[PDB]
Symmetry: C2
Subunit: 50 residues, 2 copies
């Protein structure tokens, strides 16, 4: 509301926004994986200390 | 086509057009009934001649 029935709307820059979204998502996923690996390595180092 | 999806359109004078349509339809129906009655009366007069 208040758009009557269904209307078509157009996004500004779909393809460029998609490319930047892919870049950001890949960076975030790599960050997650690296954080998990760092936690595991910290646990391994703590075990190796003892 | 080419109207996108469904759009709303507005008629100019719905109520006045409806009133005149009712008038014309009533006149036409009365004409039909009167024509039928005239045919029947012509048949009756032709029979009465014989």
């Amino acid at each position: 509301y208040p758009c009557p029935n269904t209307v078509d709307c157009f996004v500004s820059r779909p393809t460029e926004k998609t490319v930047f979204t892919v870049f950001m998502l890949a960076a975030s996923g790599i960050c997650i994986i690296l954080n998990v690996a760092e936690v595991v390595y910290l646990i391994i180092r703590a075990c190796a200390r003892r």
